[PDB]
Amino acid sequence: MEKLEVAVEHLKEAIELIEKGEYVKADLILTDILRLLEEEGVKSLIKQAKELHIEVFKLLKEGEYKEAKALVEALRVSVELYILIKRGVREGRPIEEIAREVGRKLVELAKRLEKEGISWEEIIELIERILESIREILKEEGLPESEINRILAVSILEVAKYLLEKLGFDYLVELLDRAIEYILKGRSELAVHLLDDIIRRVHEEIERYGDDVPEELLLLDLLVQKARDLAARI
Amino acid sequence: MEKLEVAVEHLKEAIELIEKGEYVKADLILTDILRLLEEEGVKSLIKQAKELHIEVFKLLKEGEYKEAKALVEALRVSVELYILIKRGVREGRPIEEIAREVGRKLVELAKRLEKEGISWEEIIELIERILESIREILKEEGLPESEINRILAVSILEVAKYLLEKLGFDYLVELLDRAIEYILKGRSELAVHLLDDIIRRVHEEIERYGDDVPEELLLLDLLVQKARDLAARI
Amino acid sequence: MEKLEVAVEHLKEAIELIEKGEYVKADLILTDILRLLEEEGVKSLIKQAKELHIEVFKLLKEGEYKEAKALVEALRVSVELYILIKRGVREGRPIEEIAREVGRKLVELAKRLEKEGISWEEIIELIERILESIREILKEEGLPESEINRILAVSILEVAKYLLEKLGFDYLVELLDRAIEYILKGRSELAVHLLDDIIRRVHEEIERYGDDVPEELLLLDLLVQKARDLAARI
Amino acid sequence: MEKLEVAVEHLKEAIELIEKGEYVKADLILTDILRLLEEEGVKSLIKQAKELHIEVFKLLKEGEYKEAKALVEALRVSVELYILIKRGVREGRPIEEIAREVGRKLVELAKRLEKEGISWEEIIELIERILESIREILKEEGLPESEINRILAVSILEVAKYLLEKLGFDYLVELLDRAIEYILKGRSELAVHLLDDIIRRVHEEIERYGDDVPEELLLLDLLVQKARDLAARI
Ligand SMILES: [Zn+2]
Ligand SMILES: [Zn+2]
Ligand SMILES: [Zn+2]
Ligand SMILES: [Zn+2]
Ligand SMILES: [Zn+2]
Ligand SMILES: [Zn+2]
Ligand SMILES: [Zn+2]
Ligand SMILES: [Zn+2]
């Protein structure tokens, strides 16, 4: 799969070019990356690359350098995640470590985007787009719905855990590791009950905050709720 | 149809790059524009873009910057005209205002090329190539032959009117507006008779000039004759 | 076939760009050349161009400028050779002069690569890849196996003759021209016997050298042996 | 096609022999040329060669050396034109340059015959016979009627242009280049209108001359009229 590694290197080159200030070369590199991905033949990556070309051209016209860099980084993370999923499935790796790797990659991307200056709503939306791409890729590999839902729930819960650590709620963090371990080991109903208790605690914290609720708490609430829904659907 | 607007912006970027002096980037941009147009799926635009790539590469090798700029501007005008035709047909706009817009765009392109330094024979040939592209595009939209011929005749007559204004024959200009109005309102036979009288007057002027006939008069003669043929075919 | 001449000019531009130091523009030019060749529709050239893009990107990442330049020059020579083969076959040119032209082009490429600093093993491998491409192209034109083998044997023998001239064995050179003339005139069995005698003389020279045999002598041995095999298969 | 080059060399030898004074050897050479052309297998050339043998024998009996030389030169030009047409069609050359070459060859033949002392009526008749041979040859190559008519019209117009230059009508010459360019570029109706205006101007010149009209003007009138008919039939 060296074509996809070449695509990843190109994407890094495109990020560096946008940083330098050459936007024509960045647009041409995006076209080259689209050609490479179409040569490989992954549909989700292909549509993401085409929309990336169009939207990055528009943003570079307007002057939104950070948004274009974020979109390129999101596509890069998506391609690397597809590579790692294929390597894990071929090598017969356990679903557990694949899910942990996906969560780690998503958290690293979120930390990068937070360092750049992108707001957390945009970060969450980019992460969910990547998660939908991951869902399609996993469904392509013939995996059943249970493991797909498990991986997605674990990744969402890892992002939520990073948010909780930022907020400073250590006990909820510990309960989150417990729930993640239960999801990974296959014990679904216990994890769902744990997630219900976590949701109640989060709502109590939000109600305590009152009118000055930080946006991270609301995003964490939404993330934990959708992770609980996925764990129920397992 | 934002893909075609992105293509138009690219074409503007290509013109600016040719002006600056970066010919490799211009060639690569032309390839990108061809990819965009093929993604959209308009056959005439696609063949025009491929021949544009080849011929602009050759001309930039030779050093004919103005000819390459003229070809890129012609493709840009053709793409914008296709966009406007699609918007007019979808919105149910009257054929009259569509024809007036097409004529205005062609006259603006001719004025631009005249300012650049391209001779009037090349300008006329480029305009007729654009007109053939317009004819194909209009036939694609399911329009009948009568309105297509009306639009084409009006555009040709607007170019001829600009030529007459340059020459300084005001009365022939006024007769030309009368004929254009008659064509636009649907009165075809009156317009054909008016065009016959205009052709006779133009031939009288040419015969008066003798051996020192400017080329604009001969080009105007040819344009009015072909417009009269189209009006007859309406 | 002006598309292939445009591709050749592009390849020259790519070599010049690699020499200057712009590797992004070189990568983009390689993508453009691949698009041109795919537009023309020659399968061997297409696969060679794709692998060239990938490998040149990798080498320019590593810093092997000379290897990338050699690969681009090999693709350029292959495209020019295809052009000349098509022109010769269409014009009904004799197989003799086509074979002489192919040999001259291969020798010029080898001299160029030797001047650059590429070792003779790499030069020979590149030449054999070009020869396999030539074999496929000739088989496409509907030529029978005898003339294809004759052309390939003549080209290999011309490369071997250049190697012998470098070594300084004039008599073996003269015998090689005699064998090449016999192959070109159609006399195959006499050429095979001459090649057997040449092979015996080369082995005698190698045995005389002992442990200090230059690599050119061994490469010449292999080349003459494969040329004799092709001449037998005629 | 080296047989036809041998035939051309023979025809040159025959012209030289007629110039020297050996008429028996010239008759025998004409028989040899007929045998060569029949070996090649071009019907028009074959019938032309047989009638050439008969008529040159008769003329050399009578003493009309110049007429026999003119007939041999006409056959030579016809054979060379067939060679060039075949080379152009095989090589995929554009119709434009083929037409220009045919016109140049016809003008050179006309200049040669004028230098010899043959009258312009005979020159025109020989040229039209060659043109009919060209029409048959082009129809043999599978070309459609439009390009055949275009080539024939361009050649006739080039002969007419030479006549106009001899007469000394520069403005009509310039209009003729304009019409030739329009025919070559494919714009037929504009060329027909231009030819109509040229015909009117030529008739005005003839009427101005009165009773002392040179024959070149009448031949030019006929040539331009037939070229206009061919351009209309395009
Ligand atoms: Zn672009
Ligand atoms: Zn509980
Ligand atoms: Zn290019
Ligand atoms: Zn009237
Ligand atoms: Zn690339
Ligand atoms: Zn022997
Ligand atoms: Zn005889
Ligand atoms: Zn006129």
DSSP state letters, chain C? -HHHHHHHHHHHHHHHHHHHT-HHHHHHHHHHHHHHHHHHT-HHHHHHHHHHHHHHHHHHHHT-HHHHHHHHHHHHHHHHHHHHHHHHHHTT--HHHHHHHHHHHHHHHHHHHHHHT--HHHHHHHHHHHHHHHHHHHHHTT--HHHHHHHHHHHHHHHHHHHHHHHT-HHHHHHHHHHHHHHHHT-HHHHHHHHHHHHHHHHHHHHHHTT---HHHHHHHHHHHHHHHHHHH-
SS3 assignment, position A143: coil
Residues 6+ apart with CB under 8 A from D210: none
CA C161, C163, C166, C172 dihedral sign is negative
How far CA A179 is from CA of A101, A166, A196, C124, in Å, comes to 17, 19, 10, 63
Closest approach of B145 to chain A, Cα-based (Å): 37
Q: Which residues of A92-119 are buried (b: 16+ CB within 10 A; e: fewer)?
A: eeebbebbbbbbebbbebbeebeeeebe
The radius of gyration computed from the CA coordinates of chain A, to the nearest angstrom, equals 19
| CB interface of C with D, residues 92-121, below 8 Å | 92
* Residues lying with their CB under 5 A of ligand 1, a single-atom ion: A 27; B 32
Distance CA D183, CA D198 (A): 14
Answer for the pair D137, D44: CB distance below 8 angstroms, yes or no. yes
Q: Using CB atoms, pick whichever of C28, C50, C58 lies closest to residue A28.
A: C28
- Nearest partner of A180 among A202, A153, A199, judged by Cα: A153
- Nearest partner of B151 among B105, B196, B108, B109, judged by Cα: B105
Q: How many CA atoms lie within 13 A of B59 on its CB side?
A: 18
Answer for the pair D163, D223: CB distance below 8 angstroms, yes or no. yes
Distance CA C24, CA A10 (A): 9
Answer for the pair C81, C141: CB distance below 8 angstroms, yes or no. no
Judged on CB neighbours under 10 Å (0-12, 13-18, 19+), C80 is middle
CA C42, distance to chain mean position in Å, is 18
- Here the tokens at position D60 are 């050399």
One-letter amino acid of B151 = I
Cα-Cα-Cα-Cα torsion A45, A47, A51, A54, nearest 10 degrees, comes to 100
One-letter amino acid of D151 = I
Answer for the pair C69, A18: CB distance below 8 angstroms, yes or no. no
B50 touches chain C (CB under 8 A): yes
CB atoms within 10 A of CB D207: 9
Q: Which residues of A59-89 are buried (b: 16+ CB within 10 A; e: fewer)?
A: bbeeeebebbbbbbbbbbbbbbbbeebbebb
- Nearest partner of B102 among B202, B38, B15, B180, judged by Cα: B180
CB atoms within 10 A of CB A25: 20
- Here the tokens at position A9 are 């290197």
CA diameter of chain C: 54
One-letter amino acid of C76 = R
Distance CA A137, CA A40 (A): 14
Answer for the pair B195, B224: CB distance below 8 angstroms, yes or no. yes
Segments of B34-160 assigned E as strands: none
- Here the tokens at position C94 are 């004799």
To one decimal place, what's the resolution in Å? 2.7
- Nearest partner of A131 among A55, A226, A65, judged by Cα: A226
CB atoms within 10 A of CB C79: 25
- Here the tokens at position A234 are 């397992």
Q: Tokens 């490369």 correspond to what residue?
A: C159
How far CA B146 is from CA of B103, B139, D220, in Å, comes to 17, 11, 41
Report how far ligand 1's centroid is from the alpha carbon of B28 (Å).
9
Nearest Cα residue in chain A from C35:
A35
Distance CA B107, CA B130 (A): 12
Answer for the pair D173, D198: CB distance below 8 angstroms, yes or no. no
Helix (H), strand (E) at residue B163: helix B145-167
| Phi/psi at D111 (5° precision) | -65, -40
Distance CA A144, CA A140 (A): 10
In this complex, do A29 and C28 lie within 8 Å of one another by their Cβ atoms?
Answer: yes
Closest approach of A46 to chain B, Cα-based (Å): 13
Distance CA A218, CA A167 (A): 11
Nearest ligand by distance to the CA of A39: 5
Give the number of beta-carbon pairs within 8 Å between C and D: 8
Closest approach of D190 to chain B, Cα-based (Å): 6
For helices C170-185 and C95-116, the axis angle rounded to 10 degrees is: 140
Q: Is A48 left (phi over 0), alpha (psi -120 to 50) or beta?
A: alpha
Answer for the pair C72, C11: CB distance below 8 angstroms, yes or no. yes
Q: Tokens 């991905």 correspond to what residue?
A: A37
Answer for the pair A223, A230: CB distance below 8 angstroms, yes or no. no
C35 touches chain B (CB under 8 A): yes
- Here the tokens at position C69 are 């330049």
Q: Which residues of C touch A13 (CB under 8 A)?
A: 24
Q: Which residues of C touch D1 (CB under 8 A)?
A: 92
C39 touches chain B (CB under 8 A): yes
How far CA A96 is from CA of A87, C23, C45, C54, C202, in Å, comes to 14, 41, 45, 34, 65
Distance CA D180, CA D175 (A): 9
The radius of gyration computed from the CA coordinates of chain C, to the nearest angstrom, equals 19
- Nearest partner of D113 among D158, D143, D169, D72, judged by Cα: D72
- Here the tokens at position B37 are 């147009």
Residues 6+ apart with CB under 8 A from C97: C88
CA D87, distance to chain mean position in Å, is 18
The one-character DSSP state at D22 is -
Answer for the pair A18, A69: CB distance below 8 angstroms, yes or no. yes
Q: Tokens 């040179």 correspond to what residue?
A: D214
Distance CA D23, CA D44 (A): 25
Residues 6+ apart with CB under 8 A from A197: A175
Q: Tokens 């990938």 correspond to what residue?
A: C54
Answer for the pair B148, B139: CB distance below 8 angstroms, yes or no. yes
Answer for the pair C177, C161: CB distance below 8 angstroms, yes or no. yes
Answer for the pair B49, B74: CB distance below 8 angstroms, yes or no. no
Report how far ligand 8's centroid is from the alpha carbon of B200 (Å).
9
Report how far ligand 7's centroid is from the alpha carbon of D37 (Å).
16
| Phi/psi at D47 (5° precision) | -65, -40
SS3 assignment, position A188: helix
- Establish whether chain D is in contact with chain A, requiring a minimum of 3 CB pairs below 8 angstroms: no
Closest approach of B129 to chain A, Cα-based (Å): 29
How was this model experimentally determined? cryo-EM
